[PDB]
PDB file of C-alpha atoms in Angstrom:
ATOM      1  CA  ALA A   1      20.556 -14.752   4.804  1.00  0.00           C
ATOM      2  CA  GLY A   2      19.742 -11.762   2.502  1.00  0.00           C
ATOM      3  CA  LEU A   3      17.071  -9.129   1.660  1.00  0.00           C
ATOM      4  CA  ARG A   4      14.109 -10.214  -0.550  1.00  0.00           C
ATOM      5  CA  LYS A   5      10.773  -8.558  -1.266  1.00  0.00           C
ATOM      6  CA  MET A   6       8.123 -10.290   0.750  1.00  0.00           C
ATOM      7  CA  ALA A   7       4.546 -10.377   1.890  1.00  0.00           C
ATOM      8  CA  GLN A   8       3.059 -11.285   5.304  1.00  0.00           C
ATOM      9  CA  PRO A   9       0.794 -14.348   5.068  1.00  0.00           C
ATOM     10  CA  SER A  10      -2.739 -13.891   3.703  1.00  0.00           C
ATOM     11  CA  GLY A  11      -4.820 -16.605   5.362  1.00  0.00           C
ATOM     12  CA  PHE A  12      -6.432 -14.390   8.009  1.00  0.00           C
ATOM     13  CA  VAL A  13      -7.528 -12.118   5.163  1.00  0.00           C
ATOM     14  CA  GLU A  14      -8.630 -14.622   2.426  1.00  0.00           C
ATOM     15  CA  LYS A  15     -11.602 -15.713   4.487  1.00  0.00           C
ATOM     16  CA  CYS A  16     -12.896 -12.110   4.560  1.00  0.00           C
ATOM     17  CA  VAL A  17     -13.056 -11.694   0.799  1.00  0.00           C
ATOM     18  CA  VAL A  18     -16.403 -11.877  -1.060  1.00  0.00           C
ATOM     19  CA  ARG A  19     -17.843 -11.402  -4.610  1.00  0.00           C
ATOM     20  CA  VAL A  20     -20.086  -8.275  -4.560  1.00  0.00           C
ATOM     21  CA  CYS A  21     -22.229  -8.069  -7.660  1.00  0.00           C
ATOM     22  CA  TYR A  22     -24.640  -5.188  -8.373  1.00  0.00           C
ATOM     23  CA  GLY A  23     -26.607  -5.520 -11.659  1.00  0.00           C
ATOM     24  CA  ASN A  24     -23.877  -5.775 -14.456  1.00  0.00           C
ATOM     25  CA  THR A  25     -20.813  -4.777 -12.317  1.00  0.00           C
ATOM     26  CA  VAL A  26     -18.694  -7.348 -10.412  1.00  0.00           C
ATOM     27  CA  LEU A  27     -15.987  -6.653  -7.863  1.00  0.00           C
ATOM     28  CA  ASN A  28     -14.536  -7.663  -4.453  1.00  0.00           C
ATOM     29  CA  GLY A  29     -15.763  -6.925  -1.006  1.00  0.00           C
ATOM     30  CA  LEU A  30     -14.477  -7.360   2.445  1.00  0.00           C
ATOM     31  CA  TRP A  31     -16.803  -8.949   4.903  1.00  0.00           C
ATOM     32  CA  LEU A  32     -16.129  -8.116   8.548  1.00  0.00           C
ATOM     33  CA  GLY A  33     -18.707  -8.918  11.318  1.00  0.00           C
ATOM     34  CA  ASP A  34     -22.047  -8.210   9.622  1.00  0.00           C
ATOM     35  CA  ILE A  35     -20.644  -5.604   7.149  1.00  0.00           C
ATOM     36  CA  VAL A  36     -19.386  -6.025   3.594  1.00  0.00           C
ATOM     37  CA  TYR A  37     -17.061  -3.159   2.627  1.00  0.00           C
ATOM     38  CA  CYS A  38     -16.622  -2.461  -1.136  1.00  0.00           C
ATOM     39  CA  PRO A  39     -16.029   0.394  -3.564  1.00  0.00           C
ATOM     40  CA  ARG A  40     -19.192   2.462  -4.075  1.00  0.00           C
ATOM     41  CA  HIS A  41     -18.775   2.436  -7.830  1.00  0.00           C
ATOM     42  CA  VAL A  42     -20.321  -1.103  -7.874  1.00  0.00           C
ATOM     43  CA  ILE A  43     -23.702   0.534  -8.059  1.00  0.00           C
ATOM     44  CA  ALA A  44     -22.931   3.087 -10.818  1.00  0.00           C
ATOM     45  CA  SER A  45     -24.906   2.249 -14.030  1.00  0.00           C
ATOM     46  CA  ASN A  46     -22.441   3.768 -16.544  1.00  0.00           C
ATOM     47  CA  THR A  47     -18.688   4.047 -15.661  1.00  0.00           C
ATOM     48  CA  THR A  48     -18.140   6.140 -18.808  1.00  0.00           C
ATOM     49  CA  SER A  49     -19.450   9.624 -17.977  1.00  0.00           C
ATOM     50  CA  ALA A  50     -19.228  11.863 -14.859  1.00  0.00           C
ATOM     51  CA  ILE A  51     -20.949   9.961 -12.076  1.00  0.00           C
ATOM     52  CA  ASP A  52     -23.358  11.677  -9.736  1.00  0.00           C
ATOM     53  CA  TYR A  53     -23.123   9.494  -6.608  1.00  0.00           C
ATOM     54  CA  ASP A  54     -25.684  11.175  -4.423  1.00  0.00           C
ATOM     55  CA  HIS A  55     -28.125  10.431  -7.325  1.00  0.00           C
ATOM     56  CA  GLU A  56     -26.668   6.971  -7.849  1.00  0.00           C
ATOM     57  CA  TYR A  57     -27.242   6.134  -4.152  1.00  0.00           C
ATOM     58  CA  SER A  58     -30.701   7.575  -4.345  1.00  0.00           C
ATOM     59  CA  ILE A  59     -31.801   5.078  -7.099  1.00  0.00           C
ATOM     60  CA  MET A  60     -30.015   2.090  -5.665  1.00  0.00           C
ATOM     61  CA  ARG A  61     -32.255  -0.993  -5.270  1.00  0.00           C
ATOM     62  CA  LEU A  62     -30.785  -3.582  -2.981  1.00  0.00           C
ATOM     63  CA  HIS A  63     -32.299  -6.619  -4.640  1.00  0.00           C
ATOM     64  CA  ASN A  64     -29.775  -5.969  -7.417  1.00  0.00           C
ATOM     65  CA  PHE A  65     -27.054  -6.986  -4.948  1.00  0.00           C
ATOM     66  CA  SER A  66     -25.810 -10.437  -4.769  1.00  0.00           C
ATOM     67  CA  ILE A  67     -22.897 -11.029  -2.428  1.00  0.00           C
ATOM     68  CA  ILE A  68     -21.184 -14.392  -2.265  1.00  0.00           C
ATOM     69  CA  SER A  69     -18.699 -15.842   0.216  1.00  0.00           C
ATOM     70  CA  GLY A  70     -17.223 -19.043  -1.143  1.00  0.00           C
ATOM     71  CA  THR A  71     -20.356 -20.838  -2.175  1.00  0.00           C
ATOM     72  CA  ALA A  72     -22.816 -19.014   0.121  1.00  0.00           C
ATOM     73  CA  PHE A  73     -25.228 -16.126  -0.512  1.00  0.00           C
ATOM     74  CA  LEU A  74     -25.279 -13.296   1.954  1.00  0.00           C
ATOM     75  CA  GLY A  75     -28.594 -11.545   2.492  1.00  0.00           C
ATOM     76  CA  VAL A  76     -28.299  -7.793   2.145  1.00  0.00           C
ATOM     77  CA  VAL A  77     -30.518  -5.818   4.560  1.00  0.00           C
ATOM     78  CA  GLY A  78     -28.931  -2.318   4.440  1.00  0.00           C
ATOM     79  CA  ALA A  79     -26.211  -0.224   2.775  1.00  0.00           C
ATOM     80  CA  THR A  80     -24.877   3.234   3.444  1.00  0.00           C
ATOM     81  CA  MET A  81     -22.264   5.310   1.606  1.00  0.00           C
ATOM     82  CA  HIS A  82     -19.129   6.710   3.281  1.00  0.00           C
ATOM     83  CA  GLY A  83     -16.772   8.662   1.067  1.00  0.00           C
ATOM     84  CA  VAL A  84     -15.796   6.331  -1.797  1.00  0.00           C
ATOM     85  CA  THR A  85     -17.018   3.077  -0.231  1.00  0.00           C
ATOM     86  CA  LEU A  86     -20.189   1.295   0.594  1.00  0.00           C
ATOM     87  CA  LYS A  87     -20.915  -0.366   3.944  1.00  0.00           C
ATOM     88  CA  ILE A  88     -23.393  -3.068   3.031  1.00  0.00           C
ATOM     89  CA  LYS A  89     -25.163  -4.513   6.086  1.00  0.00           C
ATOM     90  CA  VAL A  90     -25.981  -8.248   5.787  1.00  0.00           C
ATOM     91  CA  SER A  91     -27.746 -10.655   8.129  1.00  0.00           C
ATOM     92  CA  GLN A  92     -24.865 -13.139   8.279  1.00  0.00           C
ATOM     93  CA  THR A  93     -21.934 -12.615  10.599  1.00  0.00           C
ATOM     94  CA  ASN A  94     -18.494 -13.669   9.442  1.00  0.00           C
ATOM     95  CA  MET A  95     -17.342 -16.159  11.977  1.00  0.00           C
ATOM     96  CA  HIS A  96     -13.831 -16.032  10.473  1.00  0.00           C
ATOM     97  CA  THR A  97     -13.545 -12.268  11.163  1.00  0.00           C
ATOM     98  CA  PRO A  98     -10.003 -11.902  12.665  1.00  0.00           C
ATOM     99  CA  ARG A  99      -9.018  -9.632  15.500  1.00  0.00           C
ATOM    100  CA  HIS A 100      -8.635  -6.342  13.582  1.00  0.00           C
ATOM    101  CA  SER A 101      -8.514  -2.556  13.219  1.00  0.00           C
ATOM    102  CA  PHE A 102      -8.423   0.057  10.471  1.00  0.00           C
ATOM    103  CA  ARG A 103      -5.511   2.425  10.025  1.00  0.00           C
ATOM    104  CA  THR A 104      -4.862   5.097   7.431  1.00  0.00           C
ATOM    105  CA  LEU A 105      -1.386   4.715   5.813  1.00  0.00           C
ATOM    106  CA  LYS A 106       1.218   7.547   5.770  1.00  0.00           C
ATOM    107  CA  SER A 107       3.764   8.393   3.073  1.00  0.00           C
ATOM    108  CA  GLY A 108       6.130   5.418   2.741  1.00  0.00           C
ATOM    109  CA  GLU A 109       4.469   2.867   5.026  1.00  0.00           C
ATOM    110  CA  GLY A 110       4.756  -0.647   3.618  1.00  0.00           C
ATOM    111  CA  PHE A 111       1.769  -2.949   3.433  1.00  0.00           C
ATOM    112  CA  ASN A 112       0.422  -6.085   1.783  1.00  0.00           C
ATOM    113  CA  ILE A 113      -2.018  -6.411  -1.083  1.00  0.00           C
ATOM    114  CA  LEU A 114      -4.171  -9.435  -1.612  1.00  0.00           C
ATOM    115  CA  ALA A 115      -5.094  -9.326  -5.239  1.00  0.00           C
ATOM    116  CA  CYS A 116      -8.565 -10.727  -5.763  1.00  0.00           C
ATOM    117  CA  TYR A 117     -10.757 -11.306  -8.817  1.00  0.00           C
ATOM    118  CA  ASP A 118     -14.135 -13.001  -8.576  1.00  0.00           C
ATOM    119  CA  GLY A 119     -14.166 -12.696  -4.861  1.00  0.00           C
ATOM    120  CA  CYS A 120     -11.085 -15.045  -4.705  1.00  0.00           C
ATOM    121  CA  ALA A 121      -7.477 -14.331  -3.722  1.00  0.00           C
ATOM    122  CA  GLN A 122      -5.177 -14.888  -6.754  1.00  0.00           C
ATOM    123  CA  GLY A 123      -1.946 -13.255  -5.553  1.00  0.00           C
ATOM    124  CA  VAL A 124      -0.240 -11.417  -2.716  1.00  0.00           C
ATOM    125  CA  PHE A 125       2.575  -8.858  -2.637  1.00  0.00           C
ATOM    126  CA  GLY A 126       4.236  -6.160  -0.502  1.00  0.00           C
ATOM    127  CA  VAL A 127       3.984  -2.602  -1.686  1.00  0.00           C
ATOM    128  CA  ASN A 128       4.811   0.742  -0.205  1.00  0.00           C
ATOM    129  CA  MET A 129       2.377   3.652  -0.193  1.00  0.00           C
ATOM    130  CA  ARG A 130       4.206   6.197  -2.292  1.00  0.00           C
ATOM    131  CA  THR A 131       4.836   9.922  -1.700  1.00  0.00           C
ATOM    132  CA  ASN A 132       2.297  10.760  -4.487  1.00  0.00           C
ATOM    133  CA  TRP A 133      -0.310   8.488  -2.793  1.00  0.00           C
ATOM    134  CA  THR A 134      -0.245   5.709  -5.404  1.00  0.00           C
ATOM    135  CA  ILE A 135       1.249   2.270  -5.635  1.00  0.00           C
ATOM    136  CA  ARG A 136       2.876   0.316  -8.403  1.00  0.00           C
ATOM    137  CA  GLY A 137       0.668  -2.732  -8.196  1.00  0.00           C
ATOM    138  CA  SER A 138      -0.308  -5.214 -10.828  1.00  0.00           C
ATOM    139  CA  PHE A 139      -4.037  -5.456 -11.385  1.00  0.00           C
ATOM    140  CA  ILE A 140      -6.434  -5.913 -14.244  1.00  0.00           C
ATOM    141  CA  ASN A 141     -10.193  -5.761 -14.643  1.00  0.00           C
ATOM    142  CA  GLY A 142     -12.059  -6.838 -11.495  1.00  0.00           C
ATOM    143  CA  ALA A 143      -9.236  -6.199  -8.934  1.00  0.00           C
ATOM    144  CA  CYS A 144     -11.323  -3.425  -7.347  1.00  0.00           C
ATOM    145  CA  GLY A 145     -12.136  -3.917  -3.723  1.00  0.00           C
ATOM    146  CA  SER A 146      -8.955  -5.965  -3.258  1.00  0.00           C
ATOM    147  CA  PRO A 147      -7.754  -5.391   0.329  1.00  0.00           C
ATOM    148  CA  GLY A 148      -4.477  -4.137   1.622  1.00  0.00           C
ATOM    149  CA  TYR A 149      -3.446  -5.236   5.062  1.00  0.00           C
ATOM    150  CA  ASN A 150      -0.854  -5.586   7.790  1.00  0.00           C
ATOM    151  CA  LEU A 151      -0.316  -8.206  10.552  1.00  0.00           C
ATOM    152  CA  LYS A 152       0.837  -6.556  13.732  1.00  0.00           C
ATOM    153  CA  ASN A 153       0.351  -7.300  17.496  1.00  0.00           C
ATOM    154  CA  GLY A 154      -1.632 -10.473  16.654  1.00  0.00           C
ATOM    155  CA  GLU A 155      -4.321  -8.532  14.795  1.00  0.00           C
ATOM    156  CA  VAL A 156      -5.046  -7.629  11.203  1.00  0.00           C
ATOM    157  CA  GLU A 157      -4.787  -3.961  10.180  1.00  0.00           C
ATOM    158  CA  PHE A 158      -6.893  -3.000   7.189  1.00  0.00           C
ATOM    159  CA  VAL A 159      -5.417  -0.074   5.308  1.00  0.00           C
ATOM    160  CA  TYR A 160      -6.195  -0.265   1.630  1.00  0.00           C
ATOM    161  CA  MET A 161      -9.057  -1.077  -0.634  1.00  0.00           C
ATOM    162  CA  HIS A 162      -8.403  -0.972  -4.332  1.00  0.00           C
ATOM    163  CA  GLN A 163     -10.268   1.623  -6.355  1.00  0.00           C
ATOM    164  CA  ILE A 164      -8.788   2.821  -9.698  1.00  0.00           C
ATOM    165  CA  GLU A 165      -6.015   2.796 -12.247  1.00  0.00           C
ATOM    166  CA  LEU A 166      -4.703   6.063 -13.588  1.00  0.00           C
ATOM    167  CA  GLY A 167      -3.537   6.853 -17.137  1.00  0.00           C
ATOM    168  CA  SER A 168       0.052   6.186 -15.913  1.00  0.00           C
ATOM    169  CA  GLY A 169      -0.461   2.611 -14.706  1.00  0.00           C
ATOM    170  CA  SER A 170      -0.303   3.727 -11.097  1.00  0.00           C
ATOM    171  CA  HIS A 171      -2.918   2.467  -8.710  1.00  0.00           C
ATOM    172  CA  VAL A 172      -4.993   4.094  -5.975  1.00  0.00           C
ATOM    173  CA  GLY A 173      -7.202   2.767  -3.207  1.00  0.00           C
ATOM    174  CA  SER A 174      -9.015   4.210  -0.257  1.00  0.00           C
ATOM    175  CA  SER A 175      -8.898   3.483   3.480  1.00  0.00           C
ATOM    176  CA  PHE A 176     -11.833   1.706   5.026  1.00  0.00           C
ATOM    177  CA  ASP A 177     -13.408   5.011   6.154  1.00  0.00           C
ATOM    178  CA  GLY A 178     -13.891   5.990   2.507  1.00  0.00           C
ATOM    179  CA  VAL A 179     -11.059   8.444   2.004  1.00  0.00           C
ATOM    180  CA  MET A 180      -9.177   7.995  -1.237  1.00  0.00           C
ATOM    181  CA  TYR A 181      -5.472   8.271  -0.707  1.00  0.00           C
ATOM    182  CA  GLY A 182      -4.222  11.388  -2.476  1.00  0.00           C
ATOM    183  CA  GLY A 183      -7.729  12.885  -2.811  1.00  0.00           C
ATOM    184  CA  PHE A 184      -8.263  11.110  -6.139  1.00  0.00           C
ATOM    185  CA  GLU A 185     -11.774  10.685  -7.446  1.00  0.00           C
ATOM    186  CA  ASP A 186     -13.758   7.574  -8.380  1.00  0.00           C
ATOM    187  CA  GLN A 187     -14.617   9.139 -11.719  1.00  0.00           C
ATOM    188  CA  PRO A 188     -13.576   7.954 -15.215  1.00  0.00           C
ATOM    189  CA  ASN A 189     -11.722  11.247 -16.216  1.00  0.00           C
ATOM    190  CA  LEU A 190      -7.997  11.728 -16.519  1.00  0.00           C
ATOM    191  CA  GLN A 191      -6.211  12.439 -13.216  1.00  0.00           C
ATOM    192  CA  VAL A 192      -2.503  13.000 -13.032  1.00  0.00           C
ATOM    193  CA  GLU A 193      -0.511  12.229  -9.863  1.00  0.00           C
ATOM    194  CA  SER A 194       2.136  14.499  -8.303  1.00  0.00           C
ATOM    195  CA  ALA A 195       5.555  13.097  -9.420  1.00  0.00           C
ATOM    196  CA  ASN A 196       7.072  10.194  -7.431  1.00  0.00           C
ATOM    197  CA  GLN A 197       9.923  10.905  -5.016  1.00  0.00           C
ATOM    198  CA  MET A 198      12.335   8.167  -3.936  1.00  0.00           C
ATOM    199  CA  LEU A 199      12.042   7.560  -0.185  1.00  0.00           C
ATOM    200  CA  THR A 200      15.403   8.375   1.319  1.00  0.00           C
ATOM    201  CA  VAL A 201      14.524   6.712   4.551  1.00  0.00           C
ATOM    202  CA  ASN A 202      14.205   3.312   2.735  1.00  0.00           C
ATOM    203  CA  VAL A 203      17.273   3.692   0.556  1.00  0.00           C
ATOM    204  CA  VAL A 204      19.149   4.245   3.831  1.00  0.00           C
ATOM    205  CA  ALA A 205      17.703   1.159   5.465  1.00  0.00           C
ATOM    206  CA  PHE A 206      18.599  -0.716   2.342  1.00  0.00           C
ATOM    207  CA  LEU A 207      22.228   0.407   2.470  1.00  0.00           C
ATOM    208  CA  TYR A 208      22.339  -0.659   6.105  1.00  0.00           C
ATOM    209  CA  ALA A 209      20.876  -4.037   5.129  1.00  0.00           C
ATOM    210  CA  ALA A 210      23.710  -4.034   2.669  1.00  0.00           C
ATOM    211  CA  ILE A 211      26.262  -3.311   5.334  1.00  0.00           C
ATOM    212  CA  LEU A 212      24.778  -5.999   7.624  1.00  0.00           C
ATOM    213  CA  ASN A 213      25.350  -8.380   4.775  1.00  0.00           C
ATOM    214  CA  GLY A 214      28.715  -8.442   3.014  1.00  0.00           C
ATOM    215  CA  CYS A 215      28.245  -5.443   0.722  1.00  0.00           C
ATOM    216  CA  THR A 216      30.599  -2.466   1.331  1.00  0.00           C
ATOM    217  CA  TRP A 217      32.420  -1.552  -1.885  1.00  0.00           C
ATOM    218  CA  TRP A 218      30.149   1.535  -2.341  1.00  0.00           C
ATOM    219  CA  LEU A 219      30.928   2.662   1.146  1.00  0.00           C
ATOM    220  CA  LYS A 220      33.343   5.568   1.430  1.00  0.00           C
ATOM    221  CA  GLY A 221      34.231   7.430   4.606  1.00  0.00           C
ATOM    222  CA  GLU A 222      33.319  10.914   3.403  1.00  0.00           C
ATOM    223  CA  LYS A 223      30.270  12.415   5.262  1.00  0.00           C
ATOM    224  CA  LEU A 224      27.393  14.612   3.938  1.00  0.00           C
ATOM    225  CA  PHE A 225      25.473  16.529   6.549  1.00  0.00           C
ATOM    226  CA  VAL A 226      21.686  16.233   6.606  1.00  0.00           C
ATOM    227  CA  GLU A 227      20.834  19.774   5.565  1.00  0.00           C
ATOM    228  CA  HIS A 228      23.098  19.572   2.500  1.00  0.00           C
ATOM    229  CA  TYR A 229      21.579  16.134   1.679  1.00  0.00           C
ATOM    230  CA  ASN A 230      18.152  17.729   1.757  1.00  0.00           C
ATOM    231  CA  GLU A 231      19.166  20.680  -0.431  1.00  0.00           C
ATOM    232  CA  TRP A 232      20.437  18.134  -2.981  1.00  0.00           C
ATOM    233  CA  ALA A 233      17.353  15.859  -2.577  1.00  0.00           C
ATOM    234  CA  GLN A 234      14.654  18.560  -3.078  1.00  0.00           C
ATOM    235  CA  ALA A 235      16.229  18.921  -6.577  1.00  0.00           C
ATOM    236  CA  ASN A 236      17.051  15.286  -7.620  1.00  0.00           C
ATOM    237  CA  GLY A 237      13.757  13.429  -6.865  1.00  0.00           C
ATOM    238  CA  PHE A 238      14.242  12.263  -3.217  1.00  0.00           C
ATOM    239  CA  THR A 239      12.372  12.837   0.074  1.00  0.00           C
ATOM    240  CA  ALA A 240      13.958  14.963   2.717  1.00  0.00           C
ATOM    241  CA  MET A 241      15.760  13.025   5.415  1.00  0.00           C
ATOM    242  CA  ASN A 242      13.931  13.967   8.533  1.00  0.00           C
ATOM    243  CA  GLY A 243      14.159  11.169  11.066  1.00  0.00           C
ATOM    244  CA  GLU A 244      17.943  10.800  11.445  1.00  0.00           C
ATOM    245  CA  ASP A 245      17.193   9.279  14.835  1.00  0.00           C
ATOM    246  CA  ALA A 246      15.281   6.146  13.724  1.00  0.00           C
ATOM    247  CA  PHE A 247      18.681   4.334  13.421  1.00  0.00           C
ATOM    248  CA  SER A 248      20.268   2.088  16.156  1.00  0.00           C
ATOM    249  CA  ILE A 249      21.556   0.341  13.002  1.00  0.00           C
ATOM    250  CA  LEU A 250      23.975   3.228  12.985  1.00  0.00           C
ATOM    251  CA  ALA A 251      25.356   1.600  16.160  1.00  0.00           C
ATOM    252  CA  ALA A 252      24.917  -2.141  15.303  1.00  0.00           C
ATOM    253  CA  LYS A 253      27.404  -1.968  12.481  1.00  0.00           C
ATOM    254  CA  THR A 254      28.345   1.371  14.014  1.00  0.00           C
ATOM    255  CA  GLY A 255      31.289   2.804  12.085  1.00  0.00           C
ATOM    256  CA  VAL A 256      28.595   3.743   9.588  1.00  0.00           C
ATOM    257  CA  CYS A 257      26.640   6.842  10.519  1.00  0.00           C
ATOM    258  CA  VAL A 258      23.588   8.119   8.681  1.00  0.00           C
ATOM    259  CA  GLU A 259      25.576  10.829   6.916  1.00  0.00           C
ATOM    260  CA  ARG A 260      27.931   8.428   5.030  1.00  0.00           C
ATOM    261  CA  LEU A 261      24.854   6.673   3.517  1.00  0.00           C
ATOM    262  CA  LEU A 262      23.331  10.040   2.597  1.00  0.00           C
ATOM    263  CA  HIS A 263      26.569  10.611   0.665  1.00  0.00           C
ATOM    264  CA  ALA A 264      26.672   7.120  -0.737  1.00  0.00           C
ATOM    265  CA  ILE A 265      23.233   8.058  -2.020  1.00  0.00           C
ATOM    266  CA  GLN A 266      24.471  11.086  -3.919  1.00  0.00           C
ATOM    267  CA  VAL A 267      27.201   9.111  -5.598  1.00  0.00           C
ATOM    268  CA  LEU A 268      25.122   6.029  -6.290  1.00  0.00           C
ATOM    269  CA  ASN A 269      22.065   7.774  -7.677  1.00  0.00           C
ATOM    270  CA  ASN A 270      24.035   8.188 -10.887  1.00  0.00           C
ATOM    271  CA  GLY A 271      24.786   4.529 -11.512  1.00  0.00           C
ATOM    272  CA  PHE A 272      26.296   1.476  -9.940  1.00  0.00           C
ATOM    273  CA  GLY A 273      28.474   0.950 -13.040  1.00  0.00           C
ATOM    274  CA  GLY A 274      27.503  -2.703 -13.487  1.00  0.00           C
ATOM    275  CA  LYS A 275      28.386  -3.596  -9.875  1.00  0.00           C
ATOM    276  CA  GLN A 276      25.416  -4.570  -7.636  1.00  0.00           C
ATOM    277  CA  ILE A 277      24.138  -4.403  -3.985  1.00  0.00           C
ATOM    278  CA  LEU A 278      22.061  -7.276  -2.518  1.00  0.00           C
ATOM    279  CA  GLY A 279      21.417  -8.207  -6.140  1.00  0.00           C
ATOM    280  CA  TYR A 280      19.920  -4.842  -7.254  1.00  0.00           C
ATOM    281  CA  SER A 281      21.327  -2.523  -9.943  1.00  0.00           C
ATOM    282  CA  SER A 282      20.295   0.867  -8.546  1.00  0.00           C
ATOM    283  CA  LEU A 283      19.159   2.529  -5.394  1.00  0.00           C
ATOM    284  CA  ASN A 284      16.057   0.780  -4.007  1.00  0.00           C
ATOM    285  CA  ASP A 285      13.330   2.410  -1.861  1.00  0.00           C
ATOM    286  CA  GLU A 286      11.038  -0.634  -1.382  1.00  0.00           C
ATOM    287  CA  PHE A 287      12.233  -1.646   2.153  1.00  0.00           C
ATOM    288  CA  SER A 288      11.437   0.382   5.252  1.00  0.00           C
ATOM    289  CA  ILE A 289      13.478   0.132   8.486  1.00  0.00           C
ATOM    290  CA  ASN A 290      10.844  -2.212   9.936  1.00  0.00           C
ATOM    291  CA  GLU A 291      11.072  -4.392   6.947  1.00  0.00           C
ATOM    292  CA  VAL A 292      14.906  -4.510   7.162  1.00  0.00           C
ATOM    293  CA  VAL A 293      14.992  -5.182  10.935  1.00  0.00           C
ATOM    294  CA  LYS A 294      12.437  -7.948  10.417  1.00  0.00           C
ATOM    295  CA  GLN A 295      14.558  -9.892   7.946  1.00  0.00           C
ATOM    296  CA  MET A 296      17.975  -9.227   9.533  1.00  0.00           C
ATOM    297  CA  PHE A 297      17.005  -9.724  13.161  1.00  0.00           C
ATOM    298  CA  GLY A 298      13.740 -11.655  12.932  1.00  0.00           C
ATOM    299  CA  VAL A 299      12.543  -8.679  14.783  1.00  0.00           C
ATOM    300  CA  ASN A 300       8.746  -8.470  14.155  1.00  0.00           C
TER     301      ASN A 300
END
């Protein structure tokens, strides 16, 4: 068919989403077994000055919690703090808990976001975790606690929980063990990300997706060896190519080796001149190899 941005279905995840309210503050939580995971900033009194969390945890009173799943109240019995999250123990067990694990995402791994507002899923979209540990999502007030996930091996991988928006518009979450991606803080001060780098690996995959489809006009026969691609990349806003081997796509539509795409990349970085490629007007780093092999070969 073609290449289109896509999410994996959200139904195994929607059932896990709850409204966590603490005094004035409202946000989302993720209820697995007898634990509701949520951002620890729910319990801060004033999100306007430096927040002392050890002190904030110390004056927490649990009766201020109200946690709702659908129409049902969950009875809080315990809560502990782990990095930038809160594990709230409740008496109810979520009987819709899917088979699942927790993984920490690496630079350039794709995932899904289920954007939630009053404890209810409102939208879902694929994003990549960027080189500077942020995503370009689309959230407004109350998105916090929204979960990122993957479906793989008949289980649900939890990887992202939404935490903050930076001055830039870029978004940052933490993993379910409480580590913020990129070491960012859950504080209301200005934090500035390292600059974004285009992921070479995905622009490659994308060119191959292009070759697998009918799109070749941009495809010359001149090569550009890896180490000279990297030299150029470290100075034009691209990741180093270091994974040459991850292609058997090199062999499917063979003729095309990795080093002709790394050249195509050089030339194309500076404009498509009104031509297009799979319907895009400039290099695109939003599809990983996995993502490309899934839509071309139904891989999965």
